Amino acid sequence: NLLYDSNGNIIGFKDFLTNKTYTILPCYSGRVSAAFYQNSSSPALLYRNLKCSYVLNNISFISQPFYFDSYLGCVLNAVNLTSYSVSSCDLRMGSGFCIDYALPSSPYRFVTFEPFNVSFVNDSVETVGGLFEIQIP
């Protein structure tokens, strides 16, 4: 009447009154990671690996006007501005993503982290007349 795995956890059963089979799955119990500025009023929430339309409908009932899907999860109280890049952040959220809170819509943002870059030069990589063009101090 019961189904178990190698570790010893029940993952199913069978009811003897209706002759039906089911599957037991662990219920959600997670944790929220929030970033807060120095003298702000409300931190920016981030539910990791939780798509939107599920937090604001099943686990959260607080009216949140700003929400969008990201690569890490459903972000609350933020604006989608991933096109902007900044080489300095104190709020690092994941794989190359930052918040970059701006001094006063949602004051917090969501930008890309690019700490290191290269120095470009306006030269030609193809030789001309058998010579090369470089810069000498």
Partner: protein, 430 residues
């Protein structure tokens, strides 16, 4: 007499999965009576989360130091366009270049790096896609569902794979086009001849066998790329990291099913068959047992990051002393004869490609360590030997047999006639 060019791989681990564990939901997930007995150990759980935070901070600092060394003082042209030429000196470096610039998608890894991430499931992107398929769908049989719901989750690093893969590409194109910020001039076709000459090979042969050297690099890279369809030492070390981390997380998860002397392992059964006064003695045995297993994991994880941080320091040195600038050190980058070294991105570390000078043929000759001339003078060779051909003294290199006349540009002068030097009052140089 004859020579070829060889190549080999090398993997150095510079990263580790970041694990975050909370002792609140591990022992007292949802039971209220559990928290009343854990409040006495309030400082005990606060330190567990504090140590796990400073461990992940060390992996973040070491990750930025590797990325900084890859692009430390690199200059590239604004008209590079590494998608049309992809070649230099008839050498195929297409398998070592991805996409440079913002005119591409989210994937910019080189073809050689694709053979390494297609064999490792639990990569940086693997943990993100795995945790996404638990809160919705069907067939929830993955073991990461239970670990995440009990308080064991892996966080992604600061820099993504695409960003790190884009830093190794800039270091490769650096020593291919002007201004050659990875070799301080001395273009790639000439940079190889300068270092081979340092081993004791004359430049008269290198300038005549430029096609043999060019075809040797293409054959070496082809054997390395084809060598991944096997069980090499590189893939064995990469898979050992993701397998050792899985065993540590599964062993800690089984600690919730032990009794430690109590009547059972589930807190709901204890709080449903015993009175409150005699129930604290059973819960205390579970709290004192689960907290001990946490210290065993924290102490083991701290003793593991020290070896990874120590190994990461060696990888930074090889970028600065073997890739971006060849050092005069011997037996450091490779094995004896060393020419160049290239770096590529690898899961939880970096991959190095070392090129070496490997002779094929040999011949026996009679050499002399130095001869004394007429006039109480003496000479000594410089990275070579003195041979006798047709009743005349010549000069040859220590790594290639090619007789050359004795001159002042390859012979060290001396003002003393030693006793164990061969006499030859026929050779005149001044």
């Amino acid at each position: 007499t004859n020579f070829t060019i060889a190549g080999h791989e090398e993997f150095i681990q510079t990263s580790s999965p970041k694990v975050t564990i909370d002792c609140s939901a591990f022992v007292c997930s949802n039971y209220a009576a559990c928290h009343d007995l854990l409040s006495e150990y309030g400082t005990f759980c606060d330190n567990i989360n504090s140590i796990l935070n400073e461990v992940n901070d060390l992996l973040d600092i070491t990750q930025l130091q590797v990325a900084n060394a890859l692009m430390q003082g690199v200059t590239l042209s604004s008209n590079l366009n590494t998608n049309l030429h992809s070649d230099v000196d008839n050498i195929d470096f297409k398998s070592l270049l991805g996409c440079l610039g913002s005119q591409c998608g989210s994937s910019s890894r080189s073809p050689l790096e694709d053979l390494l991430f297609n064999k490792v499931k639990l990569s940086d992107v693997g943990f993100v896609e795995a945790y996404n398929n638990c809160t919705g769908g069907s067939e929830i049989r993955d073991l990461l569902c239970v670990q995440s719901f009990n308080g064991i989750k892996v966080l992604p690093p600061i820099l993504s794979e695409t960003q790190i893969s884009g830093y190794t590409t800039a270091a490769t194109v650096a020593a291919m086009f002007p201004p050659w910020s990875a070799a301080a001039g001395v273009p790639f076709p000439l940079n190889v001849q300068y270092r081979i000459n340092g081993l004791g090979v004359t430049m008269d042969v290198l300038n005549k066998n430029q096609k043999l050297i060019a075809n040797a690099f293409n054959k070496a890279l082809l054997s390395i790329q084809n060598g991944f369809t096997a069980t090499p030492s590189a893939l064995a070390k990469i898979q050992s990291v993701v397998n050792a981390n899985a065993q540590a997380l599964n062993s800690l998860l089984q600690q919730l099913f032990n009794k430690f002397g109590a009547i059972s392992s589930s807190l709901q059964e204890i709080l449903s068959r015993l009175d409150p006064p005699e129930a604290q003695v059973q819960i205390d045995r579970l709290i004192n047992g689960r907290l001990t297993a946490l210290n065993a994991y924290v102490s083991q994880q701290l003793s593991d990051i020290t070896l990874i941080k120590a190994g990461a320091s060696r990888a930074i040195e090889k970028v600065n002393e073997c890739v971006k600038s060849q050092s005069p050190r011997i037996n450091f980058c490779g094995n004896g004869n060393h020419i160049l070294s290239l770096v590529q991105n690898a899961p939880y570390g970096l991959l190095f490609i070392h090129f070496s000078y490997k002779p094929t043929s040999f011949k026996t000759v009679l050499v002399s360590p130095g001869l004394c001339l007429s006039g109480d003078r003496g000479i000594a060779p410089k990275q070579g030997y003195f041979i006798k051909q047709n009743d005349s003294w010549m000069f040859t290199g220590s790594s290639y047999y090619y007789p050359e006349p004795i001159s002042d540009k390859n012979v060290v002068f001396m003002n003393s006639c030693s006793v164990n030097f061969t006499k030859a009052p026929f050779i005149y140089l001044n």
